[PDB]
Amino acid sequence: RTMSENLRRNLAALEAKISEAKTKKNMLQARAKAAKANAELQQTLAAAAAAAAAAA
Amino acid sequence: RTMSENLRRNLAALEAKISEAKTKKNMLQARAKAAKANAELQQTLAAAAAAAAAAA
Amino acid sequence: FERMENKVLDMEATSQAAGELAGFGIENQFAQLEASSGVEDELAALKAS
Amino acid sequence: GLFDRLGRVVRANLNDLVSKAEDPEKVLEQAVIDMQEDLVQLRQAVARTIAEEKR
Amino acid sequence: GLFDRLGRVVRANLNDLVSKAEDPEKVLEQAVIDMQEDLVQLRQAVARTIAEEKR
Amino acid sequence: GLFDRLGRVVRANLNDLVSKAEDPEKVLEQAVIDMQEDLVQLRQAVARTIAEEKRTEQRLNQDTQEAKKWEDRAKLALTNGEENLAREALARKKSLTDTAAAYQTQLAQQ
Numbered sequence: 001r002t003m004s005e006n007l008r009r010n011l012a013a014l015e016a017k018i019s020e021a022k023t024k025k026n027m028l029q030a031r032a033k034a035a036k037a038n039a040e041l042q043q044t045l046a047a048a049a050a051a052a053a054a055a056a
Numbered sequence: 057r058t059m060s061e062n063l064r065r066n067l068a069a070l071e072a073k074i075s076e077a078k079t080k081k082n083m084l085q086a087r088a089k090a091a092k093a094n095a096e097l098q099q100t101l102a103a104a105a106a107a108a109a110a111a112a
Numbered sequence: 113f114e115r116m117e118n119k120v121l122d123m124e125a126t127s128q129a130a131g132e133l134a135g136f137g138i139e140n141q142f143a144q145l146e147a148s149s150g151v152e153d154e155l156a157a158l159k160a161s
Numbered sequence: 162g163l164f165d166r167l168g169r170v171v172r173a174n175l176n177d178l179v180s181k182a183e184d185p186e187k188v189l190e191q192a193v194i195d196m197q198e199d200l201v202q203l204r205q206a207v208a209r210t211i212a213e214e215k216r
Numbered sequence: 217g218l219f220d221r222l223g224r225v226v227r228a229n230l231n232d233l234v235s236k237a238e239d240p241e242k243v244l245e246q247a248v249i250d251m252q253e254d255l256v257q258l259r260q261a262v263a264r265t266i267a268e269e270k271r
Numbered sequence: 272g273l274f275d276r277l278g279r280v281v282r283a284n285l286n287d288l289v290s291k292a293e294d295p296e297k298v299l300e301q302a303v304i305d306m307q308e309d310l311v312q313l314r315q316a317v318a319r320t321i322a323e324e325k326r327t328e329q330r331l332n333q334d335t336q337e338a339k340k341w342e343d344r345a346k347l348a349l350t351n352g353e354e355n356l357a358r359e360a361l362a363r364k365k366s367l368t369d370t371a372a373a374y375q376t377q378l379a380q381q
Binding site for chain 3: 314318319323326
Binding site: 016019020023024026027030031033034037038040041044045048051053054056 | 293298302303305306309312313316317319320323326327330334359362363366367370373374377381
């Protein structure tokens, strides 16, 4: 009955950080989608400038 | 008779959120149908502009 | 349920963004004006009768 | 372990492959049907314990 | 880029080659037929949205 | 470098050789066709970013109200003296306020 208190505190301290991780992943997946949308835009703008139809 | 009170509160706290979920799903299914109607419209407008019958 | 709510919100925002942005541009933005038809002068002349 | 890292990679790809098979409009109401009959089963099990605190 | 310049040159020759295949008298009225059935499709899609502003 | 000077000389001759292959009347309108479909591609890419400035605003409004739920639930514990449970609810609140500040920064930039 000293071990069982020690385990019972450790068990609460785990789920307390499953809650923290699960709120962070939402914010990180949001950022990952935004970053990838801007990458495709900047790639498109560069390809258009490489064709230089206005100079032709 | 301590367990039975605890279970009897948990049992009420479940159906209270079945009621909440069932009102939200109606609003979400409405939004899903509207969003999909606009997708088909925007696809149609783009295809028509790609044919450019007025330019021919 | 929570996971499937988020898909609906992604569909909705994708649809609204394209339609809002397609709402710009001279041909549409002038089509919202009542006198855009260009025959206002001969209408005013007809109104002389 | 290295074999855990390869495990989690292959396990995560398969879990995503399922997730994009879920049609929102259908599964968004099967979820409520499941969540309702779960309450029916629970209610029976609870009542089967009250029967013995009486006893 | 040099390969873009060669691309646009060859692409423009092919686009002109098509353009002188168009017979005016025929295509000048297929253009109107296409432009009419486009309105039929559009009208259906619009009506399918009014149905939900009602709803 | 000498090999750069020879490079630029040979590279310039080849670039002129292409330039006199361009027929004005044909290329002068392919140039406009290219310049038009470039706008179609651009418009799609832009719209795909507006879709997410709409979206971070929805997420922000959730977490700024989820935190108030946990702030209330903490006070409801202190009135029962249950400090061990109030501290837990406050820990839930903290991480919500921290991530909400990330959306404000992201949104203002977008």
